Each structure stands twice: as C-alpha cells, then as structure tokens.
Write a protein that binds this ligand. Structure first.
Ligand SMILES: [Mg+2]
Lengths: 70, 29, 172
RNA sequence: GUCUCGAGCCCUAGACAGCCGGGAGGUGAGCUUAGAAGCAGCUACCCUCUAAGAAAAGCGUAACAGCUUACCGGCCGAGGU
C-alpha cells in the first residue's frame, strides 16, 4: 500500500535524479527528525520490532545515493 | 574448540537463564 | 576387512560355493560373487563379506559386493521398476510385447520391426504411451530397460531433429 | 593403476560427500534507460529479521519468471582434505 523508499526521499529533498557515483558526489540532505517521519509510515514493509532499527533500514538507501545527514 | 562455538554456547546459556548439539551443550550447563 | 549385512525378515538367503541365491515374495535372484581372497558367507541371519587383504583393489570389490547384495534384498521385496515414455513426432510408433520380447513397429516409417529380447524374469507392462519395466534382478531389469531405449538408436541422422523413441523417465 | 613415506589444515562442540529443509525483508539498490527488477553497462556494495541468506557465484528470460551457488539448519556417523 505504502510507496517505495526511493520515492519517499525525493519528496522531502527537492531533488529528482540521484548521482553517477554515491557518497563521492553529494546530492540531497535530510535531518534527524526527517528520518523519524519515514520510520512511522513503514510498519508492515519492515521486519524490525523497534523504531530505532526501523530508521537504520531507511539510512541503508540514503548514504548510497548522495544524501548527507546533519 | 573454535571460538565462535564457545561464544554461541554463551549466547544460548544467556537466553535459557532469562545447531542441536550447541543447545544440548547449553542445557547441560 | 569385514562388512556384515543384516538380512530382512521378508528375505531368506542360501549360498552354494561362490553363488548366492536370495529369495523373497517378489522372486529369486542368484548371483556369482567371485574375486581373489574375498569370502562371502551366510552367518545365519547375516551375510558376511570378508578378506585378509585391505588394498585399493580388494576394497573396491568389497563395496561392489555390498551394493549387489543390498540390491538383491530390495529386489526380492519391493522390486525394481523403471518407467519409460514413448515419444513420436510424425510416425505413429507401435510398441508391443510379443512373447518374451518387446517389438517396436513403424519407427520413423520403417517397414521392418525392431525388436529386443527381455532378460530373465523381467516383466514389461504397457499402458498406451507409458511402459514399466519390472523385476527382482536389477541387472536384468536395468538392461531390458536400457535395451528398449538403445533399440531406437539413430547414428545416421541428427538426434536433435529426429527425437523419436522410448526414453527412460523414472530410475529407481 | 597400485604400493610406501612426509608435511599442513578440518573433525563426535559431528568433519568430507550425499539427501531433505531454509535460502527471508527494506527494495524491483541508484545511475543509465521505453525497460533492466543478483546476473547489458557504470558506481556503490549499505542494515533489519535471524539459525542462515550476496547491492548475488553460474545458467536461464525481450524484461520478469524459473534453476540452483554461496551461506544456515536436519538426517547420517568417522575419518576427511
Ligand atoms: Mg548427413
């Protein structure tokens, strides 16, 4: 029901296309509270029990795109 | 006696207080 | 070395020199087991295969004798069954069991019937497009089955285009 | 082919092989692209669930799918490499 991870990052970033080489070329940016909003939405999609580990799965797509956390 | 097997027996003994051979080893403890 | 094989309750086996007869409810199989310094005997309820020599060649045959006897045990109880399917593209192949031999007619359009003789107490039953080769002796059954597949051998033309023939579908 | 001798490593906390079972999710990674979802190319190759399970080793598909590899568990039981 809930849309994929790649699309949900592009909504609260302002950028559409990623990069040719990740982490080496920084594109978008997210905050600490902005990752806590994406962790609330995906409950049946993720197999994690706690809300702490649910955030780590979203970050597993972020730094491998060009999204820096500040 | 491999180090991972020793650390696994210690992980199973922890979940009894709170492979089938590694469970049996932990039950004897 | 010495390997002891326990005889099943359905089975009873006697020994005469180098020959071993194995009887059961599905039939009887007599095999000759002859090799240098390997003594095969029946110790009441067990079959013993032993030798004073432990060299690579002696060990090779001890293991072969073991599998031959275990196979005879399975043969006289449950039996041996090979399942085969007859495939044809253009020409309607007539597979039939005429007497103690299985005859194949009109293969690839041939006027002359191809035939092979059935080995021993092996029974070949046909049910339209399916054939089941069965019996107690794995040597006899395995060969009769193979012989049927080998009977439609084509060396002259391409096997990839001319795929007609009876092939082994099930192996026990 | 077979015989003999040495060295290293693995093994009843169950090795080697075989067979059964599992091979899960975020997500079909992103870029490229009409599309590419382990597997055309480029780059990265990250974390959850867990006893395991690669950003996929080899086939396979127009792309999927499908078949298995790694890896984990079971059966087995003695040497194995
Ligand atoms: Mg020619």
């Amino acid at each position: 029901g809930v849309p994929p991870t790649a699309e949900l990052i592009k909504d609260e970033a302002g950028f559409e296309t990623g990069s040719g080489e990740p982490q080496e070329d920084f594109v978008a940016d997210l905050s600490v509270d902005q990752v806590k909003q994406i962790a609330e939405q995906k409950h049946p999609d993720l197999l994690s029990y706690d809300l702490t580990n649910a955030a780590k799965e979203v970050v597993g797509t972020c730094t491998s795109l060009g999204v820096t956390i500040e | 006696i491999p180090e991972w097997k020793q650390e696994e027996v210690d992980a199973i003994v922890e979940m009894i207080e709170s492979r089938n051979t590694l469970l049996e080893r932990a039950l004897d403890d | 070395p010495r390997v002891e094989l326990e005889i099943p309750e359905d089975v009873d086996a006697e020994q005469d020199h180098l020959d071993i007869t194995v009887e059961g409810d599905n039939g009887s199989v007599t095999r000759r087991l002859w090799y240098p310094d390997i003594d095969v005997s029946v110790d009441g309820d067990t079959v013993v295969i032993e030798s004073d020599e432990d060299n690579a060649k002696t060990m090779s045959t001890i293991g072969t004798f073991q599998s031959h006897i275990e196979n005879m045990f399975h043969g006289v109880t449950e039996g041996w069954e090979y399942g085969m399917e007859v495939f044809y593209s253009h020409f309607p192949m007539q597979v039939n069991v005429e007497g103690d031999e299985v005859v194949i007619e009109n293969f690839l359009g041939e006027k002359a019937p191809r035939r092979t003789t059935i080995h021993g107490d092996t029974d070949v039953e046909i049910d339209g497009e399916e054939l089941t080769v069965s019996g107690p002796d794995i040597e006899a059954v395995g060969q009769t089955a193979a012989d049927i597949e080998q009977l439609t051998r084509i060396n002259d033309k391409d096997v990839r285009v001319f795929q007609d023939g009876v092939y082994i579908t099930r192996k026990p």
